[PDB]
Amino acid sequence: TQVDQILRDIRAVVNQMVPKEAKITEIEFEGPELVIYVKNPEGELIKDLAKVLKKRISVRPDPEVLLPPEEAEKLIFEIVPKEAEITNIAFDPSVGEVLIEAKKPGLVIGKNGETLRLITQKVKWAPKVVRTPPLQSQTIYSIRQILQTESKDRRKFLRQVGRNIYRKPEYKSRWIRITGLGGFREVGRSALLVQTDESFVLVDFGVNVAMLNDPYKAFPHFDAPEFQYVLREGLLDAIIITHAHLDHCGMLPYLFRYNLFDGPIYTTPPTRDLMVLLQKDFIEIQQSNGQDPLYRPRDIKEVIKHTITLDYGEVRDISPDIRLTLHNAGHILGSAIVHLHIGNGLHNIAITGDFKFIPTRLLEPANAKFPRLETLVMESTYGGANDIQMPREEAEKRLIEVIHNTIKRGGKVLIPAMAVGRAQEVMMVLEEYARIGGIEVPIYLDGMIWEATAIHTAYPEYLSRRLREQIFKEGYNPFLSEIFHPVANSRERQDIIDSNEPAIIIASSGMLVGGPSVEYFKQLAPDPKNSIIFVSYQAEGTLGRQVQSGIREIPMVGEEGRTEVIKVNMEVHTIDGFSGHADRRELMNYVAKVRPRPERIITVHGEPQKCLDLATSIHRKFGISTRAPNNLDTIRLR
Ligand SMILES: [Zn+2]
Ligand SMILES: [Zn+2]
Ligand SMILES: [Zn+2]
Ligand SMILES: [Zn+2]
């Protein structure tokens, strides 16, 4: 590592373009950027010295000239209008920045950007105002508490990452290869290893909850020689998470449990929070089932401490020959398409993760415009030629149809859905339907769906333009609808089931693998008055896919090794018009619209035949080279 020889040349030109009166106390790399500390604020020299050094710079005051938290926290409630209504105020010393939250962020941000600098001087801390979210999230609060109490660790973490990213100047890769450790010709445990002769980055690291009883099918291949080498030698530069779902980020905290990695995890803020929530959710579902969890809160916590967030469009160097950029995937809040600029730029890779290419209630179609692009890795969940989804609006009509029939017949509607994803989407469908007077019976929300929902309201900028304004700007907010009733605990859950009142029940998780939805299913499945509606992809080996297949008698190993058979009499429906996955038509259209036209396309994340079908179809229609690799396949990209 010749990092300090690089830092030496920087400290030379910086101490040549910076006011020597401006007592520079330090210059070092912290995360994906150069930071210059100075005890003397003050502009437009950053814009320069930055484009001169060809690096991302950030000037700040020495952490010493910063008024303590418990102190400057009262000086602020003094220097800002009481009408500004400051709901919360947090600190993040790892960046010397004060996060100020208020219902009326205008009177706190300075009626002329003034009060912003007004308080900035009185405490030296970097102010950042945030409009109070309409719903408070335990997850968000928890992450905030961790970031201000772990300041010591993170500041050290950011120095290590920085010295690592710039272990050498911009390098042109000699070779590039991608290895599927999981998620090739199957849905589950997505894990792809990007390799160059200088770097190693992991894109996604999921688990296959549908196959939890089989460690050989549930986890990415830890037995891959190249991967054991990368971990054991400490060569993994980074991990990039496309989105919050467990089959894309679920094994991430396992890596910390066993101290196999302590580098950076790059992802969008919404993803960092949703991920943390689904991971906590996961290990709790396991314990509530009497199983030993894959990891513990202490590991999920380590994940948070090792995560560096980027918003879409932010280009960042994550190693000597790899620059990252995230783009909207339109799958779920915060979902991204990973774009890796590698070496010379003549062999760039775009990794789709899961994506949607038409608008939905919460999101806009995936980005299809990139700078330079040679290889496109895309999902195939609906890759079969006949995998056309039901039109958005016909699905809505079908849903309403079914709810009416069931609610009349004196029954209940069970809609299994993941905490994040279809839950929110379906909620919007029922909410807009409520506003015209269609919701008579109550709508219960079980399985952390409400907490996830809270996270959405805190990231309006990651929602579609339509819903963005409708949220933060207006006082009215769709999720806040009085039609949704969060299930408080196991007693109420049981009350709900025993009660004779018809109702709509939306509960995690989406494939009946675990969580409240399995309880509802089991106790409601016998009565033919009830209805269960699948609105998401049912993976192979899930109870959900069994029910969906029509199997009317399902065995379930219960407590004390005794198996129990649930008799299925309730109505089984499938409405795929709410899917977060691009359907066959969308996938093919995506390839058509993507620009620049990729020289190669690799199909993944889909049942075997679907991956091949899509790959064959893309080649036949667009004449582009394609391939549906197997796990453990490695493709050299030249
Ligand atoms: Zn997903
Ligand atoms: Zn997925
Ligand atoms: Zn080429
Ligand atoms: Zn209640």
Swiss-Prot record:
Residues 580-638 are annotated as: Metallo-beta-lactamase C-terminus. Residues 4-66 are annotated as: KHa. Residues 1-187 are annotated as: Archaeal CPSF-KH domain. GO terms for biological process: DNA-templated transcription termination. Its cofactor is Zn(2+). InterPro entries: aCPSF1, Beta_Casp, KH_dom, KH_dom-like_a/b, KH_sf_prok-type, MBL, Metallo-B-lactamas, RibonucZ/Hydroxyglut_hydro. Its EC number is 3.1.-.-. Signal peptide: none annotated. Zn(2+) 1 binds at residues 243, 245, 331, 354. Terminates transcription on the whole genome. Termination is linked to FttA-mediated RNA cleavage and does not require NTP hydrolysis. Cleaves endonucleolytically at the RNA exit channel of RNA polymerase (RNAP); the 5'-3' exonuclease activity of this protein degrades the nascent RNA released from RNAP. Has nuclease activity on single-stranded RNA. Belongs to the metallo-beta-lactamase superfamily. RNA-metabolizing metallo-beta-lactamase-like family. FttA subfamily. NCBIfam families: arCOG00543. This is Transcription termination factor FttA. It comes from Pyrococcus horikoshii (strain ATCC 700860 / DSM 12428 / JCM 9974 / NBRC 100139 / OT-3).
